[PDB]
């Protein structure tokens, strides 16, 4: 199987944020599987691989754009299909960054939930 940790970044501040500001670290380890696929899960996924999506603040309902960082995307081993559904794959025993996507975002102070689905892949 896989052991997955998703770690929120400390010290995030409301207001204008840097482009691609890091917001969480994804850690996927395995003793048995060489690779994994990952997709964001929300009410508004915005690309065909599910590696960028939008999430709503708990207290305000305001939306922010989140996703894998461009560096993280460039570490993908491949994009594979599971019965037709795209999953970008990555080496296990790696970390990836989840960021604020696109140009600089102005973020209202709030708590924003993020959900990912991770699946093992044998190449």
């Amino acid at each position: 199987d896989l052991t997955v940790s998703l770690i929120p970044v400390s010290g995030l501040k409301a207001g204008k944020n840097a482009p691609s500001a890091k917001i969480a670290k994804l850690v996927v380890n395995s003793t048995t599987l060489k690779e994994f696929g990952v997709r964001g899960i929300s009410n508004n996924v915005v690309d065909s691989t599910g590696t960028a999506w939008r999430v709503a603040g708990k207290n305000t309902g305001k939306e922010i754009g989140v996703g894998l960082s461009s560096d993280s995307l460039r570490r993908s081993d491949s994009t594979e299909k599971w019965n037709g559904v795209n999953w970008m794959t990555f080496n296990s025993n790696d970390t990836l960054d989840i960021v604020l996507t696109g140009p600089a975002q102005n973020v209202t102070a709030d708590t924003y939930p993020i959900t990912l689905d991770v699946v093992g892949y044998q190449p």
Binding site: P8, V9, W87, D110, P113, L116, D117, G120, P123
Partner: peptide
């Protein structure tokens, strides 16, 4: 290649932006 359906996991966390 193949996906291992039984290995699929969902993980969720809260991201907090403070004033």
């Amino acid at each position: 290649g193949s996906f291992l359906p039984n290995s699929e996991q969902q993980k969720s966390v809260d991201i907090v932006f403070s004033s």
